[PDB]
Design a protein around this ligand. Structure first.
Ligand code: RIS
Ligand code: MG
Ligand code: MG
Ligand code: MG
Length: 339
């Protein structure tokens, strides 16, 4: 039972969940990875890790991925989450020096992950080992594009640190541009390609049907999270949320922004359904008769399928994960799973 303020019938009706066959071992390896990289303490991994559903989220998205591709994707996704918790914990304690060093370590490790596998900062070491495994699957042009995209993601996070510190809530349009980057839309879009085993040429992945579907996929995920994390994020003094920009810059009620947020999420789905047909026609055009044509068609059709998979994974993730159950915490401002 999804609460009705969050219930999306088109999702439940026409985007049935899928699950990767590797998920059971995926869940365990990542929990152990979290334990051995010391990205969380012992008792909170044992208590909270499984119930945070970070492996479920990715096992429901990257269908068809090689087990070791999925495993690296899921460690980095579990890493992405704790980096968000460390980023929010630096803000809450004005650790602007620590954030800045880490932010420069992260910028550096992203280009030379091997050189950081054993860095003193555990969070930098974990990231270096997931990114290093991420870099082994495809040519260094993919690896470079991944770095270019993550370099901008870090910078977006630095813009957030200075937004929450100086009290600035972004404007709605400033937020929609920033939210593509803090959510890391293009990271997740990049990782569609090791999951289907193929770097796409610029001409394929930048076709307007591919690009618009890839975009609407992430806009839904980012904006459904805003709808669903809004209570947690208000209680944690967070200001980066479409709901929050609409309240402070368009003088909307709490209940009015939530409907405008819900309404914008809903149109993401119906717009995706349209361009999905364009993107799938494009996949079939790519099968011109040649070998590389057949492969490029299959890779586009798998990635587009996983663009569709993202909706249901994200949707059910936000009702199953303990990360958003602010109502079950003794302290509504400090999630019990962060340090
Ligand atoms: O779980 P959260 O904190 O609501 C979030 O989605 C965490 C997150 C960060 C980056 C990518 N995906 C999720 P955020 O971006 O802070 O809104
Ligand atoms: Mg967050
Ligand atoms: Mg965040
Ligand atoms: Mg959020």
């Amino acid at each position: 039972a999804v609460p009705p303020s969050l219930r999306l019938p088109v999702i439940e009706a026409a985007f049935p969940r899928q699950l990767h066959p590797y998920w059971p071992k995926l869940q365990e390896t990542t929990r152990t990875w979290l334990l051995e990289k010391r990205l969380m303490p012992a008792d909170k991994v044992e208590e909270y890790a499984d119930g945070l559903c970070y492996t479920d989220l990715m096992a429901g998205y990257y269908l068809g991925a090689p087990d070791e591709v999925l495993q690296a994707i899921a460690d980095y996704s579990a890493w992405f989450f704790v980096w968000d918790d460390r980023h929010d914990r630096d803000i809450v304690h004005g650790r602007a020096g620590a954030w800045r060093r880490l932010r420069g370590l992260l910028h550096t490790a992203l280009d030379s992950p091997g050189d950081h596998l054993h860095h003193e900062d555990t969070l930098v070491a974990g990231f270096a080992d997931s990114v290093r495994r991420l870099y082994a699957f495809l040519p260094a042009t993919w690896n470079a594009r991944f770095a270019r995209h993550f370099h901008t993601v870090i910078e977006a996070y630095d813009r957030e640190f200075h937004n929450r510190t100086r009290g600035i809530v972004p404007g709605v349009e400033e937020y929609l541009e920033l939210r593509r980057l803090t959510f890391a839309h293009w990271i997740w879009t990049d990782l569609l390609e090791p999951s289907s085993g193929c770097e796409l040429p610029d001409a394929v992945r930048k076709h307007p049907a591919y690009r618009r579907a890839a975009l609407l996929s992430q806009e839904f995920a980012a904006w459904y999270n805003d709808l669903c994390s809004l209570p947690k994020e208000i209680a944690g003094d967070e200001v980066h949320n479409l709901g929050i920009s609409l309240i402070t810059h368009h003088s909307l009620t709490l209940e009015e922004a939530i409907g405008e947020v819900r309404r914008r999420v809903e149109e993401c789905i119906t717009e995706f359904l349209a361009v999905e047909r364009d993107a799938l026609r494009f996949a079939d055009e790519l099968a011109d008769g040649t070998v590389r044509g057949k492969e490029l068609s299959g890779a586009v059709r798998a990635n587009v399928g996983n663009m569709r998979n993202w909706f249901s994974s994200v949707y059910w993730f936000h009702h199953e994960s303990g990360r958003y159950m602010v109502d079950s915490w003794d302290d509504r401002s400090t999630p019990p799973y962060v340090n």
